[PDB]
Amino acid sequence: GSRRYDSRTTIFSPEGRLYQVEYALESISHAGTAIGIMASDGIVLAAERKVTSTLLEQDTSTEKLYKLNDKIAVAVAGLTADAEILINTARIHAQNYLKTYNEDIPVEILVRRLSDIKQGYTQHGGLRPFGVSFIYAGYDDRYGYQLYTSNPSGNYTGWKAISVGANTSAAQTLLQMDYKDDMKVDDAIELALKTLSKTTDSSALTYDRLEFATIRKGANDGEVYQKIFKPQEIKDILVKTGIT
Amino acid sequence: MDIILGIRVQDSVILASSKAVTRGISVLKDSDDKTRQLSPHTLMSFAGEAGDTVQFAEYIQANIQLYSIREDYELSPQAVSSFVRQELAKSIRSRRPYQVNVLIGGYDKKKNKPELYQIDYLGTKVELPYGAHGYSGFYTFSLLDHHYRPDMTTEEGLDLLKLCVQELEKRMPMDFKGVIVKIVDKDGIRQVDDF
Amino acid sequence: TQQPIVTGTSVISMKYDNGVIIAADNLGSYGSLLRFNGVERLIPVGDNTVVGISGDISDMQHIERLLKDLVTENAYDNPLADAEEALEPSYIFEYLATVMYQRRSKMNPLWNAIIVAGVQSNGDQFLRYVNLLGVTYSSPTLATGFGAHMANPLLRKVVDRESDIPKTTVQVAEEAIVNAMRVLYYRDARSSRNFSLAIIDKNTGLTFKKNLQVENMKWDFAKDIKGYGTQKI
Amino acid sequence: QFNPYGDNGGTILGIAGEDFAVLAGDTRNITDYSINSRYEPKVFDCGDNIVMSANGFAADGDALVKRFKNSVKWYHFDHNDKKLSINSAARNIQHLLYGKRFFPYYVHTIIAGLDEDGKGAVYSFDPVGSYEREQCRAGGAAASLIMPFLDNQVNFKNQYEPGTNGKVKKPLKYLSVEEVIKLVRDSFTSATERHIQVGDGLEILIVTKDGVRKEFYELKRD
Amino acid sequence: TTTLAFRFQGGIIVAVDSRATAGNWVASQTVKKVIEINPFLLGTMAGGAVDCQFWETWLGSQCRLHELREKERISVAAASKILSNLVYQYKGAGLSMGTMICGYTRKEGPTIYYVDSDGTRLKGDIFCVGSGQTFAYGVLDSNYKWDLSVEDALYLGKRSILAAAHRDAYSGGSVNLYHVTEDGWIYHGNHDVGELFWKVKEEEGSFNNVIG
Amino acid sequence: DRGVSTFSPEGRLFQVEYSLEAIKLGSTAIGIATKEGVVLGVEKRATSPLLESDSIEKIVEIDRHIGCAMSGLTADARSMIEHARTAAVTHNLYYDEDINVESLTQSVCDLALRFGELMSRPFGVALLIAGHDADDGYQLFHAEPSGTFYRYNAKAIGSGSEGAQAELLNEWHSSLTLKEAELLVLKILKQVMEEKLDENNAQLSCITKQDGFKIYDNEKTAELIKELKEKEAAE
Amino acid sequence: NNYDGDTVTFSPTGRLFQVEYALEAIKQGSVTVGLRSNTHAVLVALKRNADELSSYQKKIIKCDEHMGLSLAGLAPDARVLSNYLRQQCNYSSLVFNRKLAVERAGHLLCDKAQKNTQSYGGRPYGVGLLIIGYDKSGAHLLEFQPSGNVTELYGTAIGARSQGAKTYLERTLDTFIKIDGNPDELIKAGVEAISQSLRDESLTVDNLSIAIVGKDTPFTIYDGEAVAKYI
Amino acid sequence: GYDRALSIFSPDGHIFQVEYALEAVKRGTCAVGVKGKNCVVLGCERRSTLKLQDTRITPSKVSKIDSHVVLSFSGLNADSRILIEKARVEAQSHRLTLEDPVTVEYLTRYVAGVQQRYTQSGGVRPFGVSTLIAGFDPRDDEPKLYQTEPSGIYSSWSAQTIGRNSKTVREFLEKNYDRKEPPATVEECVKLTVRSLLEVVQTGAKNIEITVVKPDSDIVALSSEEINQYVTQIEQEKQE
């Protein structure tokens, strides 16, 4: 029968590893680097677009940074098509919570549920896992500013600063070097860009190969604002820090 | 089931619930507690169809307790009341709806404010300074309209509540065997033993 | 839940010494309208069984098809289909009885009263009744509808108990059946003059008689009857 | 509207002795004011020395008996030809009846036989499965006529010892098979006189350790 | 039916009648309305006979499965709740049951739970259930004290059923008595109302409404 | 790979034969049937000294008149015991009687072959089912994952089974008393066990008509162990 | 070799190896013999034990008052197939008030076994059956193989060393077929037949298993001291 | 639905998928459970290759199943969440039907039963997780500590460890734990738990988590400084 052609996507290796999860992580390691940095007064999300072409429409494009609701955003590393499936589910889950409790969803709850979906694909169903790693940046009134990451295994962890995708080893060393707890958003913006600039496989870091976003309380009085940076705004912030 | 009252004052929510359980021409019990603690600072009283009342109350209780363990965190009275309303709103269009009316008295620790919610079996939620379900309201609402003030103390609220119970004991047809009174405030939930 | 539309009236039957006789008129009524006149309500199964059906005709036709299909199915992988493993009256009845009761239990009955008449392989007479409720019973004489009220009393005068069966010949038995059919024509408003009669004998086999008519009727006394009490003309 | 139930009349009667039990029933089958059959048996030997009758709506009665007979057959297959005891049969029948609690078998069921100590046993069931072991039970159309007579003659109810000032009761004792059959026959002739659905014939099934015996008696046919 | 059970100093008394009716037809005078679930648990029956009989013996099976799985006798609370949750699933279907789950355990002590077919479950010290419950209440309440002796408590339970058996047309037959202690339930006999009424009338001097 | 319900060229089901190898790795379990009762004994085999041995439950009650011992992948036995208990209680509900030991065993063995591509693999545990009924008296059954069950006068299963079975062949006779059987299980367990036999690493049980199924206390077994050692030294 | 992974695969010579391996399980099974006259049909079965402490595996199963079989191979599969036969016999009785013909019984077993040889996931039955019965056309004996092939015979045998008994019955055909109105003699012929399949072991009291059905004899099984007569 | 039998027997009688799930447990961070005279302590290793972590929000290694029972684990983190969730739901369901919280044995038996079900169900792989379940039964003061593993077997332990280098810490506990006299106090029990982890961990900074459970739903997690005091005390006594 069909048994002959089954890859068996949800099994253990003799060493106790999940083949498909490991190979999905190997896939993600070739994706454009994405960095999240959490400051005391906001969060920075920075991501490198995958080898851009000059005829690519940059302003009306979305590859790395997505909005889940008004208080939560994600940076993507891996297959974009896979990420969008999960993003729409995450968006729906947030709205279900709001509809049920008349309160915006706490960041961890959303992260756990999305991570639980990924876990399911590694334990049952016989399907390939989602080749995606997320950096979740968000705010709620319980824990304030939060950074998380999830990966194809469905395992998630919290961070002060973290990178996913390509050159995470080099990127994490650089973040671990210059990061400190009393950091501000504007400093974190500078750290994020400086890290990408050194870890990039490109010749020089430019505005057209980046996506950028901040989650500040920089709105008027006790409320959170999401800023997905425009091309010109990335061009200005890149000059302001002296990278170009 | 019959009489459940609720009064939100300055720093607390007071719930009064009748002790009688009547069936046919027999008062089977005169010490029935028509309430469940959903969380340390949230209390729900209930009245309606026999069986449905407790079954619904305990089902909600289990769900809120489950949430509390999962998140290691207490849901706000507003959040709990919205959850309860949605369950009843689902229920009314089910094959057999829960015929249960509830009051939810809670103290929001983040806001440092007492909150009283009135929800009927249809899933009709309202936040109120004072509330009642069934025929009780027809006497107590007008009484409270007159005597209630928003800045009252817990002791003033209990005297205001005594005034309601006296009026009900005077003018209500049925013997409801007095009430169990509970207070919800910043320190949690406690029962008044002598009422 | 049904209501019968096109209906057939009484089916009558009785045992005699060597076999059974069964009869039913050829009418398909549509309420008070005597709509169809060429309706055969006796349906032979093999050469040893006749199923007489009253009630809803659309359901009767459904039952015809089931019996027809039963004969086909019995013949499958059966070298003795025309011998030792042929369909018996008792097999045919029990099948119908099962169906009738299953259908009443699903609240969607076959709106019929059925009498299965035949002779078993060992020569024994078979005569049993079943209806829309799945109720079954056997008797030396059996009748449906008005036949139960008018034919049975007449047929029971011939065969009143089991011991009267060996004493009853096919000539006497057929005479009683034919007489009963006349009485039903006098008194049943949904009956016709034309009918079919079937004899299943353990010696002579199945004899199916079509296009019989009620005859030797008494109507002459009607001319003397004038008015409804007083009136003399 | 289609009514799935009907009344086939008749009446049944079970009495238990010391080392025997009888289950009697008239052989008349009716609908409304018509007789369908003068001899249609409704008391059956179901095997394992258990006799059974399900009186009321005959279609449900036959269905039940048929299912119980089948239950006895499968009990043998599944438990190494073990004999189904009367108490086990009774419990099994309860589940058969209660299985159709929301579309009931319209019958009064009675079974009879011997218990595991060899003593006479009669069990009786309501339409939905409530059962009870008794020395005595009448079921069916003429149950209300026969049952009080049985209370008086079998269980000696309301009978006191003469001269004892109504202080000492008539002592309970087992009846012989001869005395029981006298009571059965008198019960059915009395029921035949005063009940229109009862008559034609009486069929008694007697159960002893030796097996199941039958007796038949004529009843009035009007 | 008339059934009662009350809690007192010396444990629990349980008393029931034995009549079964189908309309005004007295169908039986010898029905067992107490179910012996285990050596420490009793269940009383009122309402539809097989509904009570079937589901309470089913309850006994569930209680047996509990002590096999948990290596421990089931609590009165848990046993009553199995039954109440069961009937609640059938709510609206037309089950007719008024039951009392009575028993003793270490953690609970003597406990009585009222459970009925519309899903009501109540812990309490005194309950009377059935068509003659009010008649039983009248005698029981007016003579009840916590400090009754085992002998007096048994009699009061018996006398209360007798009171209902007399006045309620749908109660009668005989009185079945039970006494529940820390050591389990103890049967205290079947008492026919035929003899018991006259015995009680003579000895007690009560029932003066009746022609002596 | 290959089908789960595949036959070998010799005419055996691969998965059933492989599950039998898993049972050979399991801890020893011995059952002996007498006219005074049936005795069931097991090797507990704690993997470490910190493990509380009294929590090792390899002897189990199915009903008052039926007991069960296990050997192999003991986690697989839980659903088998659950089914057995439900079968036993359900039969009592339907028939107001105790269920025959053979019928109970047959009910358990019906689960065995309900695997394929129903559960994904056979059970990796063998069961010794001991009990009493009025018809066939005291009985001992060996229930395998093949769906087969044999009645036995005495039987050993697990790692030391072939050695213990050979010993049971010589020792068993039809007139054994209950006490003699108890000692015989302890004797044969002590022989095949790796670690030295005591009340903490070995458990006894029995089923009698009068008292039903009973798991022995560690105090009661300890005295039988002491009684056993004294009798072997006495000649 | 490469074509024996499942039942759904044909070999290059048109063989079904899984069906053939299932057939092999029967050959390993203990011998059982079937034979009939015109009045009676008899099953004789050599039961097998695990060891001297064990019971002897029961080979014969009753299907109805007039029908039953003996087994050789996987006993659980026989239980499944016998249960199916019990239901089919029972369906015929309840619905048609008719005792199931032994020939139809064979047709039903054939079609049930066949479905398991043409679909993915399932497996063939690993047991052979000898069905005896007495119906409206007299005594019958059938041989069921899990390939689906059912065959009506005067006599036969299946299991290990069944060729010995099968040769004997082929010689004795003219004798035992005319043993009419004599149960004990027909059994004796069956016991002598199964004896031709014995090696080193002989027929003992708890080893032999006999069953009989006939004109005025319901299907009944004899074990223990009841078969001591025939040793 | 996906039906494949993933967990199956091999010729030698092993279920490799269950055994490979144990290897995942062996890879996981070390977890230890030690029960005293009036308490149980659950110690857990946290690997220090992860700096820039946010310990406020990062999932804790010890999880509350109910107010009186806790569950720690070793192995796949994502798998553990599924078991914890089911356990928490069953805990509330037990309170609802039995009107009494679960015993530690019951909760363990349930979790173990779930794990077993995944070893002979089609289309699923076993949980790559072993758990330590600890707490106190309702109205009881006897400490309870249980262990479960992918196969589905469970058992009670006076003290136990699971995860990477668990054989080293088990060796330590086997000679340092006295059955006749368990840690009489909370301090003694925590110290023995910390000592055992210090055989394997590396540094006693933010690598060790300690959770103390006491009777009547009294559960508290120790902070960095509180744990560091035990680490500082043990090292000074060691230099001797």
Ligand SMILES: *[C@@](C)(CO)[C@](*)(O)[C@H](CC(C)C)NC(=O)[C@H](Cc1ccccc1)NC(=O)[C@H](CC(C)C)NC(=O)[C@H](CCc1ccccc1)NC(=O)CN1CCOCC1
């Ligand atoms: C007191 C005595 C009165 O209520 C008690 O409450 C007892 C309880 C004891 C027996 C456990 N209750 C009854 O006796 C109870 C009263 C009752 C009747 C019907 C509905 C609710 C309560 N009686 C019964 O349940 C009797 C049992 C005896 C054996 C006759 N059963 C019936 O009346 C049955 C079944 C009724 C039924 C219930 C649910 C669904 C369908 C039917 N009905 C008949 O037997 C019908 N009748 C008998 C006379 O012949 C004509 C048909």
